[PDB]
């Protein structure tokens, strides 16, 4: 499993996963499912930011916690936007709002209401992707164009197929159900 992760994602993502893992106190060699999930969340987040005009998105995910909070504060103190209570993943300079990306292995609408009640924000936008090509967003506003969202969708599934081609998909979808 660990070997798969390291040859499936790019070193830059892999390294960023390992960092966040050790911060929480988690061993990337023992909890290899959480390893793969973080790598995935990262990738999805980067492809999502890619998706706008050059200066559009601010990437909050992947940074160091302290530095990430400093970024948020800078936005709130400049746009007027209400400060969130938990760390989002992006900010949209076009739609004047924060974004939270999720990647789940259970239902889009199940994961949505777990994240929304956790943030309790009438301003932070939400967007959930699935390993089955499904998506849900606050007020059904999906931010990006069809082509962009479809690419991430495609990719997520390619990983889903890839794990299953080694018999790691069952264990991976079970582990998220084992977490909640
Ligand atoms: C219960 N749980 C397990 N993993 C997460 C989780 N944590 C984070 C995080 O920022 O720590 C995410 O961005 C994310 O998408 N999921 C939450
Ligand atoms: Mn996050
Ligand atoms: Mn997220």
mmCIF file of C-alpha atoms in Angstrom, residues 49-167:
data_model
loop_
_atom_site.group_PDB
_atom_site.id
_atom_site.type_symbol
_atom_site.label_atom_id
_atom_site.label_comp_id
_atom_site.label_asym_id
_atom_site.label_seq_id
_atom_site.Cartn_x
_atom_site.Cartn_y
_atom_site.Cartn_z
ATOM 1 C CA UNK A 49 -7.187 25.756 -7.875
ATOM 2 C CA UNK A 50 -5.674 25.151 -11.310
ATOM 3 C CA UNK A 51 -9.159 25.536 -12.640
ATOM 4 C CA UNK A 52 -9.628 29.299 -12.421
ATOM 5 C CA UNK A 53 -8.019 32.332 -14.002
ATOM 6 C CA UNK A 54 -4.393 32.767 -12.834
ATOM 7 C CA UNK A 55 -4.980 34.982 -9.747
ATOM 8 C CA UNK A 56 -8.346 33.457 -8.759
ATOM 9 C CA UNK A 57 -7.800 30.968 -5.917
ATOM 10 C CA UNK A 58 -5.723 31.203 -2.747
ATOM 11 C CA UNK A 59 -4.476 27.776 -1.643
ATOM 12 C CA UNK A 60 -4.949 27.254 2.116
ATOM 13 C CA UNK A 61 -4.487 23.477 2.129
ATOM 14 C CA UNK A 62 -0.945 22.092 2.094
ATOM 15 C CA UNK A 63 0.529 25.044 3.992
ATOM 16 C CA UNK A 64 1.728 24.941 7.600
ATOM 17 C CA UNK A 65 -1.168 25.464 10.040
ATOM 18 C CA UNK A 66 0.237 28.702 11.522
ATOM 19 C CA UNK A 67 0.965 30.122 8.059
ATOM 20 C CA UNK A 68 -2.475 29.004 6.819
ATOM 21 C CA UNK A 69 -4.271 30.879 9.620
ATOM 22 C CA UNK A 70 -2.169 33.979 8.891
ATOM 23 C CA UNK A 71 -3.379 33.822 5.263
ATOM 24 C CA UNK A 72 -7.037 33.521 6.274
ATOM 25 C CA UNK A 73 -6.754 36.467 8.694
ATOM 26 C CA UNK A 74 -5.272 38.553 5.857
ATOM 27 C CA UNK A 75 -8.247 37.799 3.583
ATOM 28 C CA UNK A 76 -10.915 38.469 6.231
ATOM 29 C CA UNK A 77 -9.193 41.708 7.230
ATOM 30 C CA UNK A 78 -9.219 42.879 3.582
ATOM 31 C CA UNK A 79 -12.417 41.590 1.944
ATOM 32 C CA UNK A 80 -14.651 42.074 5.007
ATOM 33 C CA UNK A 81 -15.489 38.355 4.906
ATOM 34 C CA UNK A 82 -16.467 36.651 8.161
ATOM 35 C CA UNK A 83 -13.591 34.554 9.557
ATOM 36 C CA UNK A 84 -14.209 30.765 9.596
ATOM 37 C CA UNK A 85 -13.958 28.622 12.743
ATOM 38 C CA UNK A 86 -12.092 25.765 11.021
ATOM 39 C CA UNK A 87 -9.377 25.724 8.322
ATOM 40 C CA UNK A 88 -10.873 25.838 4.814
ATOM 41 C CA UNK A 89 -9.048 24.687 1.677
ATOM 42 C CA UNK A 90 -9.305 27.631 -0.727
ATOM 43 C CA UNK A 91 -10.614 31.160 -1.081
ATOM 44 C CA UNK A 92 -12.306 32.465 -4.206
ATOM 45 C CA UNK A 93 -11.363 36.029 -5.112
ATOM 46 C CA UNK A 94 -14.053 35.994 -7.835
ATOM 47 C CA UNK A 95 -16.947 34.672 -5.726
ATOM 48 C CA UNK A 96 -15.708 36.437 -2.566
ATOM 49 C CA UNK A 97 -15.910 33.319 -0.352
ATOM 50 C CA UNK A 98 -13.967 30.437 1.255
ATOM 51 C CA UNK A 99 -14.181 26.890 -0.130
ATOM 52 C CA UNK A 100 -13.951 23.488 1.552
ATOM 53 C CA UNK A 101 -13.044 20.475 -0.581
ATOM 54 C CA UNK A 102 -13.957 16.976 0.510
ATOM 55 C CA UNK A 103 -13.219 13.599 -1.025
ATOM 56 C CA UNK A 104 -15.372 10.781 0.341
ATOM 57 C CA UNK A 105 -16.221 7.101 -0.204
ATOM 58 C CA UNK A 106 -19.793 7.319 1.125
ATOM 59 C CA UNK A 107 -22.512 9.665 -0.168
ATOM 60 C CA UNK A 108 -22.009 13.244 -1.327
ATOM 61 C CA UNK A 109 -25.035 14.454 0.691
ATOM 62 C CA UNK A 110 -23.947 12.405 3.737
ATOM 63 C CA UNK A 111 -20.482 13.974 3.908
ATOM 64 C CA UNK A 112 -21.913 17.431 3.107
ATOM 65 C CA UNK A 113 -24.112 17.697 6.226
ATOM 66 C CA UNK A 114 -21.232 16.414 8.387
ATOM 67 C CA UNK A 115 -19.031 19.269 7.187
ATOM 68 C CA UNK A 116 -21.664 22.035 7.116
ATOM 69 C CA UNK A 117 -22.840 21.557 10.722
ATOM 70 C CA UNK A 118 -19.148 21.393 11.721
ATOM 71 C CA UNK A 119 -18.422 24.843 10.211
ATOM 72 C CA UNK A 120 -21.830 26.516 10.804
ATOM 73 C CA UNK A 121 -21.106 29.245 8.235
ATOM 74 C CA UNK A 122 -23.572 31.214 6.094
ATOM 75 C CA UNK A 123 -20.517 32.235 4.006
ATOM 76 C CA UNK A 124 -18.116 29.328 3.646
ATOM 77 C CA UNK A 125 -18.968 27.424 0.485
ATOM 78 C CA UNK A 126 -18.814 23.621 0.336
ATOM 79 C CA UNK A 127 -17.978 21.171 -2.471
ATOM 80 C CA UNK A 128 -17.686 17.398 -2.150
ATOM 81 C CA UNK A 129 -16.227 14.977 -4.657
ATOM 82 C CA UNK A 130 -16.661 11.220 -4.705
ATOM 83 C CA UNK A 131 -14.911 8.187 -6.124
ATOM 84 C CA UNK A 132 -18.095 7.665 -8.194
ATOM 85 C CA UNK A 133 -18.034 10.935 -10.160
ATOM 86 C CA UNK A 134 -20.711 12.647 -8.073
ATOM 87 C CA UNK A 135 -20.677 16.190 -6.671
ATOM 88 C CA UNK A 136 -22.707 18.447 -4.366
ATOM 89 C CA UNK A 137 -22.276 22.113 -3.514
ATOM 90 C CA UNK A 138 -23.920 24.814 -1.396
ATOM 91 C CA UNK A 139 -26.965 26.096 -3.331
ATOM 92 C CA UNK A 140 -25.748 23.827 -6.192
ATOM 93 C CA UNK A 141 -23.058 26.382 -7.132
ATOM 94 C CA UNK A 142 -20.086 24.315 -8.276
ATOM 95 C CA UNK A 143 -17.636 27.189 -8.824
ATOM 96 C CA UNK A 144 -15.677 25.710 -11.743
ATOM 97 C CA UNK A 145 -16.741 24.943 -15.316
ATOM 98 C CA UNK A 146 -17.868 21.470 -16.465
ATOM 99 C CA UNK A 147 -14.550 20.521 -18.102
ATOM 100 C CA UNK A 148 -12.491 21.258 -14.975
ATOM 101 C CA UNK A 149 -14.737 19.364 -12.540
ATOM 102 C CA UNK A 150 -14.912 16.445 -14.982
ATOM 103 C CA UNK A 151 -11.100 16.085 -14.998
ATOM 104 C CA UNK A 152 -10.796 15.743 -11.224
ATOM 105 C CA UNK A 153 -13.766 13.334 -11.370
ATOM 106 C CA UNK A 154 -12.025 11.296 -14.077
ATOM 107 C CA UNK A 155 -8.766 11.249 -12.076
ATOM 108 C CA UNK A 156 -10.333 10.260 -8.740
ATOM 109 C CA UNK A 157 -11.787 7.224 -10.514
ATOM 110 C CA UNK A 158 -8.398 6.334 -12.037
ATOM 111 C CA UNK A 159 -6.999 6.031 -8.497
ATOM 112 C CA UNK A 160 -10.102 4.044 -7.448
ATOM 113 C CA UNK A 161 -9.439 1.615 -10.309
ATOM 114 C CA UNK A 162 -5.711 1.539 -9.532
ATOM 115 C CA UNK A 163 -6.081 0.547 -5.878
ATOM 116 C CA UNK A 164 -8.720 -2.089 -6.774
ATOM 117 C CA UNK A 165 -6.305 -3.457 -9.390
ATOM 118 C CA UNK A 166 -4.136 -4.381 -6.362
ATOM 119 C CA UNK A 167 -7.002 -5.222 -3.986
#
